[PDB]
Amino acid sequence: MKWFNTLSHNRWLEQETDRIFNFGKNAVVPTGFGWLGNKGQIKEEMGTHLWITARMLHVYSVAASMGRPGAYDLVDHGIKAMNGALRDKKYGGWYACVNDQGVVDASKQGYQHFFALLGAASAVTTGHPEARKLLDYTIEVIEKYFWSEEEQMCLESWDEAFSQTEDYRGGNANMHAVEAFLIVYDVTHDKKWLDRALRIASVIIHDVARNGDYRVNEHFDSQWNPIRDYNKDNPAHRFRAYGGTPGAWIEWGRLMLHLHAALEARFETPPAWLLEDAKGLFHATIRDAWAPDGADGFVYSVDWDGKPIVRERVRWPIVEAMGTAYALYTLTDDSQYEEWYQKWWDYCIKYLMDYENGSWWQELDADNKVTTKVWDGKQDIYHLLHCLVIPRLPLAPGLAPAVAAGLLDINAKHHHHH
Amino acid sequence: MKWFNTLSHNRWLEQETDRIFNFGKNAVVPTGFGWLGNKGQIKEEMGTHLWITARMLHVYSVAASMGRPGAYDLVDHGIKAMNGALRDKKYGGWYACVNDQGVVDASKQGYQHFFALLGAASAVTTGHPEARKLLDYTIEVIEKYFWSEEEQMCLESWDEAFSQTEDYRGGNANMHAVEAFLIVYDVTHDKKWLDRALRIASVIIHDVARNGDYRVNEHFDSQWNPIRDYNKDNPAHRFRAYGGTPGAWIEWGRLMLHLHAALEARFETPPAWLLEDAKGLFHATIRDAWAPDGADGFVYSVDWDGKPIVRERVRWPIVEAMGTAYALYTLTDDSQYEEWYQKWWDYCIKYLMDYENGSWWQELDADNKVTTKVWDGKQDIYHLLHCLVIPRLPLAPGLAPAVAAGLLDINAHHHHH
Amino acid sequence: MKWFNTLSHNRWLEQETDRIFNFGKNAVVPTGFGWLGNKGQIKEEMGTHLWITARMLHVYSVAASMGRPGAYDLVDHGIKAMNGALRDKKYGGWYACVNDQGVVDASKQGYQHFFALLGAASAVTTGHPEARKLLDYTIEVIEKYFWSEEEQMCLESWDEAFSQTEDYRGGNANMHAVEAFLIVYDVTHDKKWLDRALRIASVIIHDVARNGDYRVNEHFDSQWNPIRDYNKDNPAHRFRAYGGTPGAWIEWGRLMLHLHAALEARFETPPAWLLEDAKGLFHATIRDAWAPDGADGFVYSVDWDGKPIVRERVRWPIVEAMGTAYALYTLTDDSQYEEWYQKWWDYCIKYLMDYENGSWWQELDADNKVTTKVWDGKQDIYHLLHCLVIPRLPLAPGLAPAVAAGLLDINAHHHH
Amino acid sequence: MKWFNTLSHNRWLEQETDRIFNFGKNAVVPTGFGWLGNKGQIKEEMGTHLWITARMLHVYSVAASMGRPGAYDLVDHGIKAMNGALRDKKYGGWYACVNDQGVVDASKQGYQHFFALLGAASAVTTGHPEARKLLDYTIEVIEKYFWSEEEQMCLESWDEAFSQTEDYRGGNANMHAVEAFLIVYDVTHDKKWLDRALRIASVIIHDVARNGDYRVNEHFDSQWNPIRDYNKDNPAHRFRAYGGTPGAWIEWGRLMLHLHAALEARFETPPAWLLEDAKGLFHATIRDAWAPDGADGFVYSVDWDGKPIVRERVRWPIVEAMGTAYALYTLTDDSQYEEWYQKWWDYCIKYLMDYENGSWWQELDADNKVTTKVWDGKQDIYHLLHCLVIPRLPLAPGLAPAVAAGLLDINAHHHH
Ligand SMILES: OC[C@H]1O[C@@H](O)[C@@H](O)[C@@H](O)[C@@H]1O
Ligand SMILES: OC[C@H]1O[C@@H](O)[C@@H](O)[C@@H](O)[C@@H]1O
Ligand SMILES: OC[C@H]1O[C@@H](O)[C@@H](O)[C@@H](O)[C@@H]1O
Ligand SMILES: OC[C@H]1O[C@@H](O)[C@@H](O)[C@@H](O)[C@@H]1O
């Protein structure tokens, strides 16, 4: 069965994408974007998070490029929010969480600042007259506090006043740095952004993960030595789970293929390890995490021997798996990847898609029934673009640049025989 | 006005197709696919029919090839049903009807086995790893019990244990054999299937129908002699109506054009009678059955002088008419066929389409008001692909193969030359 | 940001178009098309208006050409209606308004007859076997009573019997004559239709509007001299507002560019003033009417110095502005026009589109909140095709002909 | 076998088209275009003929629209020529033939003036700044002297001073009037040219030819009564052959289908007889004139019982047959027309194409061997566009307009 690069499948994806764009519109709050619950209501107690606001700015940049009325107003809202309450006008950068009445979390989180970077870079592709100013400012914050020239890797977090950095180094924030750096590169061609991306991946993936059967180590000390037992007593942490989180492995895989494609796009032969390691991560994710416990789905985390720990099926791991299947199919022409993509789509409509309340469920238990454990509500639509829009685009340039360039369905041009 | 081979019209068709796919999803039951009612609910008392289950397997094969998440799971469900409760594990083939408790109708119905053949052949086009095995098994059953080598025609039915065949021969079962054989040909490229289809059409249409003003005779004895009086006392029978059923005539017309196109595809000149007789069937259907009684719509049945008998407007006849209009337009380029297609679409949205309760009504009275008489519920969506998907495809290969091949919209200043 | 001539934007446009076609279907009544309210219900007390019936005939002609089942039945219904109760079978032409009991308004309104002409011409593009007959008759009525050979302009209205014409000449009726004449030209090529359209535009726009900073004068006496203070006492009139109605200025702009494109289509160099004056009208509209009073949106009317009078934001002016932005973008390649189009789409979804009850609101107050003041319900869908379908087509031939020709998306990018 | 609307066939067509364009370029002379011989040199003794200069103006208009460097210079050359020595500044219109020291044939030939009209209308499609002026003037001459309002038909010829008209009416000149009128229509979108074309075809074809087994009568007296024995003593005349000339019958067929398509293009139902009679003419041409005498090819003339008179195979009849086969295929979708087109292409390359000396031979004997009898030289490339370019275009608008519109290969399969 052929779905990739078919207009019939791609029309289905677009129509679902519009349903998703509609869901996120409910998140608009004066200081940015709020946290949506299971019925698409704002959970006011959660306030305005930096990472959510930046993600929505990115999402509505893509929607704007797709020619959807109202989306550009959300881009504008996003850019205003990044210049408003979220912005620390004393020490620079952005607070982690604010609301109409003040700052709740003033800390300076690297993970969230890389999303700020992605949001600004994607906003630039819309031509919004204030987007490039925002990007330039974000670059200054990143280079001052979050890219380490000494370590040639990303730092994790600081206090409000940028006086003390966290005694921890994280694969997760570094992963989203790679993601953001790809798009910054697409809207600058300052070579350093791609160089930095390759460097980060070489350390986290080609060195550490590859040497552990492609089980990505996320937690390191300040000297970049793995802390294997980090969070052993808080294993279901939302951002720093104990052990391996296979959803991240497979996401890394796709990011490495965007890097491969960006190198190809400047007529450079990419290093072979990008594709090799992307295959490795994909294979490892299925090996350990797909249906390991008597029911379909991807578990949330595994121990260092591949045994599941948190068995809940969170939404984003399978969504990322679908994106990576597409990226691997694109580079390999191997139908096995398409078969996995299809299998996962069937699972998604069966268990995760929520036509009744809107969007998709965020989390299921080990029997694939809606649960509340790891998460609380439906606060994200950003990951969904990776299974809804990415499969309609080349791998270079990246998501927002490629949509703005008019590349949707560009490759959808007798597929049962040769 | 141009609709055929326009992306605007074809987009509308696709959007309606998705509405129809959605309606059929609630038919899923442990033993296969159940019988949906007017509001999309399962009518439990009807059980799990072989023909319905096989048709759904076919429909969701097309949906799967169209890239709809969930459709492949329904293909898988259908294949499991065909390997499970519906399959006669003792004597082979498939029971006509089952439920959770056991067998409701143990008979071995040719009509329904030809749908099993279609369903398996369409499933093959999805690449499902169990589909070819199913097709192989279905072919074995068909050649053992339902294609007669001596008659060079299809048998009608057997009892559960295949001890004796029915003393009756049917144009209806044979029509759906042609339909299935076309698709088996597409997934085998073995001319024997097309040889058989052409042979069947040559007897029922080119001989008997053509010599009867294109009024197709459906009921025959075992020597393939017409029984003109069959079911006089049960005229509104769902599968064996008394007299002629014009919806069937026009359906035969399309099938003959698929056959024509299949021959052309391998650079063989089709016999001229396929097109000639398709024209005759289409014309005769309009002649006897279109608006014959002071209101629009196709009547269900007519006597041998063309006079209406059962005057209800059932859904499938007009749907088939629309499919045949497309096929004839494709072969002739004659705009009259497109005009009919358009007129029929307008009728369908006015009277048949049911946006309130789902799908389309199954049956209307002679004033085009919803009724319950010949039928009971909304158990079919298979026919609707003939007015929704067929117009988006060439005539060769057939429906499911062509969608799998990526041919949707391939043919799409058209107000002048 | 690129939207014009992109399949992603055009798909969004088509899907909204279908939503709009669905809303109008509820307007069917035995005598034509009735007046839809905010819920898509018929407002029976409004009866069956000639202008509404003719507009719906036009709208469903386009829907039919787009391959929508049922639309042709609505064309058929409109044609029957134009041969039924609405037709004055005694004196000729069509009554302004009828109902199931008889004639409500027997007068013969030029404005509404030009819509009859448009409807018939659009219907011809469907091939409906009674459409050409309707067009031919409509042309006869227009040439007898509405196109003046002595004035080389359109007359305004008459009594039922066509015995006395109104002592008034109108820019508004003449504008919609231009619109109708373009489509009659498309389905005939009697040159006179384009000649007449150019003549009308040359008087109302090139002479009078251009000389008044592109503020179109609508109200004239029988000698075609402006009546500047017409309807001072009734400034929010639905068809003859006091002063300038900027939505009409921008509508004139687009029509002139359809005229331009028609001339190009036959390998003729169009007169330069069509584009020059389209630019002038567009600019003047932004200058006087866009967000002139501390909130977004187009006001309804302005005085002769460009100051707002009626500040309500009616639906059709912004819808027409979007159409004209597309036309100007097409001719100039200047992205400022695309930027305006996008800005206005954002405003429309924010304030005008009504996904709850259907269609779009007809009218908002000066703070962009839905109101009832100038208008009453949701009786029109015709204008919406100018921001939904027009951006998917070339400028020649016109709307219904172009859709019938299969030209949707024919023209459908961050660097050179 | 499928050729029509295939890119592979159309590429072959374009490549031959370029070889043909190249051959014509040597015809440039100071006063217009000269008469090319068998090896592509100028037959200087023939001087500059109006019909040749006008045809070359048309051909290079098409070449220019196709983006061939040098072609526009020839369009400019042709326009200058039509304003130079060929132009009668005293009495108006154009002399039939001039040379570098004066007028050779001062007569005012209708046949040649309809080609002047075609050449000007085609030149307008290139946007050359002097082309519209030329067309406008040519129209004035045609309407003064060559279209008769009284007869509703075209006259044949006049003396230099337009004092007396020839006591003769010709189906040939009228055929080329139809041809020219189609293109004038295309660059004016004005009804009257099509009305005139339809009227002309209705008389020559629907009345006279249809009632004589589709054998077109060409020679008429001043009352439009046939002269059946005209040119009995000069049967092989180049423009007025005795009896019927089947090449002309099949050419009429295509022109009627361009007429049909033009009507369709403005959403008008064309009269059924255009297609009926086009089929009739095509069939009759094969019936009487295709391989009638034991070898392939179309004879030049037949008598009124269909028997061949002049048996030479001149180039243009089969070239026109091929164009008509395309037009009939386009309207009917009947493969028999494509089969004939293919058969004729095979004959053309076997016997007519001249890769050695350039272009195609003008004339063969009854055994398909190159001969000199009816004609002398290779002065024409105009007909060749009817088998080289026409099969790559829709039937409306006509040749030069369609190429200028970007329509080449727009329509470009073993089963249904
Ligand atoms: O959407 C939130 C999730 O995003 C993924 O890419 C990872 O960064 C996870 O750690 C995180 O919980
Ligand atoms: O959908 C069921 C119908 O299918 C048609 O093709 C015919 O076989 C009818 O006899 C039958 O009732
Ligand atoms: O839709 C109704 C409106 O149409 C516009 O084009 C103008 O004619 C207005 O005066 C009128 O109120
Ligand atoms: O090319 C010259 C020829 O052109 C044809 O169309 C006819 O007019 C002939 O009579 C003429 O000899």
Q: Taking the CB of residue D147, how many other CB atoms lie within 10 A of it?
A: 22
Q: How far is CA B396 from CA B66, B410, D413, in A?
A: 18, 12, 11
Q: How far is CA A214 from CA A139, A261, B292, in A?
A: 31, 22, 73
Residue A229, classified by CB atoms within 10 Å of its CB into exposed (0-12), middle (13-18) or buried (19+), is: exposed
Question: Is B346 within 8 Å of C68 when comparing Cβ atoms?
Answer: no
Closest of A73, D17, A342 to residue B127, by C-alpha = A342
Chains D and B touch (3+ CB pairs under 8 A): yes
Q: Is A251 in the pocket of ligand 1 (CB under 6 A)?
A: yes
Q: Which residue has the tokens 């001890």?
A: B163
Dist. CA B98–CA B94, nearest whole Å: 10
Dist. CA C409–CA B412, nearest whole Å: 13
Residue D85 in tokens? 């020595």
Instruction: Give C31 Cα–ligand 3 centroid separation in angstroms.
Output: 23
Amino acid letter, D261: A
Closest of D297, D315, D305, D414 to residue D372, by C-alpha = D315
Residue D249 in tokens? 């019958």
Sign (positive or negative) of CA dihedral D120, D126, D131, D137: positive
Q: How far is CA D239 from CA A286, D112, D236, D396, in A?
A: 84, 11, 9, 28
Beta bridge partners of B148: B153
Dist. CA C1–CA A65, nearest whole Å: 6
Q: How far is CA C47 from CA C22, C101, C117, C160, D107, in A?
A: 21, 10, 21, 18, 71
Q: Taking the CB of residue B118, how many other CB atoms lie within 10 A of it?
A: 28
Nearest to A67 among C6, C350, C414 (CB): C6
Question: Helix (H, G, I), strand (E, B), or coil: what is residue C334?
Answer: coil
- Torsion region of D318: left, alpha or beta (phi above 0 gives left; psi -120 to 50 gives alpha): alpha
Q: Is B316 in the pocket of ligand 2 (CB under 6 A)?
A: yes
Beta bridge partners of C102: C99
Give B257's contacts in chain D (Cβ within 8 Å). 416
Q: Write phi, then psi, for B47 (nearest 5 degrees).
A: 70, -165
Amino acid letter, B294: G
Closest of C242, C274, C254, C408 to residue C321, by C-alpha = C254
Q: Are strands C108-109 and B102-105 parallel, antiparallel or unpaired?
A: unpaired
Residue C339 forms contact with B (CB below 8 Å):
no
Of the ligands numbered here, which is closest to the C-alpha atom of A179?
1
Dist. CA B126–CA B351, nearest whole Å: 35
Give D125's contacts in chain C (Cβ within 8 Å). 267
Dist. CA D390–CA D384, nearest whole Å: 9
Give C64's contacts in chain B (Cβ within 8 Å). 1
* Domain covering A1-418 in this structure, CATH number: 1.50.10.10
Please enumerate in sequence order all residues whose Cβ is within 8 A of that of B98, keeping only pairs 6 or more positions apart, or say none.
Answer: B31, B32, B47, B48, B85, B86, B104
Cβ-contact B58, B400 below 8 angstroms: yes
Dist. CA D94–CA D138, nearest whole Å: 9
Dist. CA B413–CA B392, nearest whole Å: 20
Q: Name the DSSP letter for residue B130.
A: T
**CA C248 from centre of chain:** 9
Residue A64 in tokens? 């704007």
Question: Is B1 within 8 Å of C68 when comparing Cβ atoms?
Answer: no
- Among D51, D111, D172, say which to mutate for ligand 4: greatest number of ligand atoms within 8 Å of CB: D172
Closest of D67, D158, D157, D60 to residue D118, by C-alpha = D60
Domain B1-417 fold: Glycosyltransferase (1.50.10)
Q: Are strands B28-29 and D32-33 parallel, antiparallel or unpaired?
A: unpaired
Question: Is A8 within 8 Å of B64 when comparing Cβ atoms?
Answer: no
Measured in Å, how far apart are chain D's first and last C-alpha atoms?
14
Identify the residue whose C-alpha is closest to ligand 1 atom 5: A248
Q: Is D144 in the pocket of ligand 4 (CB under 6 A)?
A: no
Nearest to C125 among D132, D186, D267 (CB): D267
Dist. CA D232–CA D240, nearest whole Å: 10
Q: Where are the alpha helices (DSSP H) in C125-245?
A: 131-141, 171-186, 192-201
Q: Write phi, then psi, for D295 (nearest 5 degrees).
A: -145, 155
Beta bridge partners of B103: B98
Dist. CA D302–CA D304, nearest whole Å: 7
Residue B416 forms contact with D (CB below 8 Å):
yes
Dist. CA C163–CA C154, nearest whole Å: 16
- Among B316, B383, B390, say which to mutate for ligand 2: greatest number of ligand atoms within 8 Å of CB: B316
Nearest to C414 among A70, A73, A405 (CB): A405
* Vertex C70 angle, CA C119 and B289, to 5°: 125
CATH architecture of D1-416: Alpha/alpha barrel (1.50)
Dist. CA D303–CA D292, nearest whole Å: 13
Q: Is B251 in the pocket of ligand 2 (CB under 6 A)?
A: yes
Q: Which residue has the tokens 């002479």?
A: C207
Question: Is B127 within 8 Å of A1 when comparing Cβ atoms?
Answer: yes
Way it was determined: X-ray
Q: Write phi, then psi, for A308 (nearest 5 degrees).
A: -60, 145
Question: Is B404 within 8 Å of A1 when comparing Cβ atoms?
Answer: yes
Question: Helix (H, G, I), strand (E, B), or coil: what is residue A21?
Answer: helix
Cβ-contact C363, C379 below 8 angstroms: no
Of the ligands numbered here, which is closest to the C-alpha atom of C176?
3
Dist. CA B334–CA B338, nearest whole Å: 8
Instruction: Find the largest Cα–Cα distance for chain B.
Output: 64
Residue B249 in tokens? 């005539």
Q: Taking the CB of residue A305, how many other CB atoms lie within 10 A of it?
A: 10
Q: How far is CA D172 from CA A33, A200, D205, in A?
A: 79, 83, 12
Dist. CA D231–CA C114, nearest whole Å: 59
Residue C189 in tokens? 């090529």
Closest of B254, B154, B263 to residue B199, by C-alpha = B154
Dist. CA B415–CA D394, nearest whole Å: 11
Q: Which residue has the tokens 């500059």?
A: D48
Closest of C14, C40, C9 to residue C361, by C-alpha = C40
Q: Are strands B363-364 and A108-109 parallel, antiparallel or unpaired?
A: unpaired
Write the secondary structure of chain D as one string of H (helix), E (strand) and C (coil). CCCCCCHHHHHHHHHHHHHHHHHHHHHEECCEECCECCCCCECHHHCEEHHHHHHHHHHHHHHHHCCCCCHHHHHHHHHHHHCCCCECCCCCCECCEEECCEEEECCEEHHHHHHHHHHHHHHHCCCCCCHHHHHHHHHHHHHHHHEECCCCEECCEECCCCCCECCCEEHHHHHHHHHHHHHHHHCCCCHHHHHHHHHHHHHHHHHHHHHHCCCCCCEECCCCCECCCCCCCCCCCCCCCCCECHHHHHHHHHHHHHHHHHHHHCCCCCCCHHHHHHHHHHHHHHHHHECCCCCCCECCCECCCCCECCCCEEHHHHHHHHHHHHHHHHHHCCHHHHHHHHHHHHHHHHHHECCCCCCECCEECCCCCECCCCCCCCCCCCCCHHHHCHHHCCCCCCHHHHHHCCCCCCCCCCCC
Instruction: Give A365 Cα–ligand 1 centroid separation in angstroms.
Output: 18
Question: Is B413 within 8 Å of D394 when comparing Cβ atoms?
Answer: yes
Nearest to B2 among C14, C70, C406 (CB): C406
Q: A3: distance to nearest CA of chain B, Å?
A: 5
Identify the residue among D191, D194, D267, D410 best suited for mutation to test binding to C, counting C beta carbons within 10 A and taking the highest. D267
Q: Which residue of B has its CA nearest to A9?
A: B67
Closest of C281, C189, C367, B377 to residue D268, by C-alpha = C189
Dist. CA C391–CA C10, nearest whole Å: 8
- Torsion region of D310: left, alpha or beta (phi above 0 gives left; psi -120 to 50 gives alpha): beta
Cβ-contact D386, D341 below 8 angstroms: no
Q: How far is CA C110 from CA B299, C120, C162, C166, D308, in A?
A: 48, 15, 11, 10, 65
Dist. CA A404–CA C368, nearest whole Å: 31
Question: Is C124 within 8 Å of D404 when comparing Cβ atoms?
Answer: no
Q: Is A241 in the pocket of ligand 1 (CB under 6 A)?
A: no
- Among D316, D359, D374, D387, say which to mutate for ligand 4: greatest number of ligand atoms within 8 Å of CB: D316
Residue B165 in tokens? 């065949």
Cβ-contact D213, D284 below 8 angstroms: yes
Q: B384: distance to nearest CA of chain A, Å?
A: 18
Residue B139 in tokens? 């072919």
Q: Does B397 sit behind a cis peptide bond, omega within 30 degrees of 0 on the bond before it? A: yes
Q: B343: distance to nearest CA of chain C, Å?
A: 8
Instruction: Give A238 Cα–ligand 1 centroid separation in angstroms.
Output: 7
* Vertex D398 angle, CA D392 and D402, to 5°: 55
Dist. CA D40–CA D55, nearest whole Å: 17
Question: Is B72 within 8 Å of A346 when comparing Cβ atoms?
Answer: yes
Q: D138: distance to nearest CA of chain C, Å?
A: 17
- Residue B13: its H or E element: helix B7-24
Q: Does B69 sit behind a cis peptide bond, omega within 30 degrees of 0 on the bond before it? A: no
Q: Is D251 in the pocket of ligand 4 (CB under 6 A)?
A: yes
Dist. CA B24–CA B27, nearest whole Å: 6
Identify the residue whose C-alpha is closest to ligand 2 atom 6: B248
Q: Where are the beta strands (DSSP E) in B101-218?
A: 102-105, 108-109, 147-148, 153-154, 157-158, 169-170
C-alpha gyration radius of chain D:
20
Residue B1 forms contact with C (CB below 8 Å):
yes
Residue C294 forms contact with D (CB below 8 Å):
no
Question: Is C6 within 8 Å of A406 when comparing Cβ atoms?
Answer: yes
- Torsion region of A41: left, alpha or beta (phi above 0 gives left; psi -120 to 50 gives alpha): beta
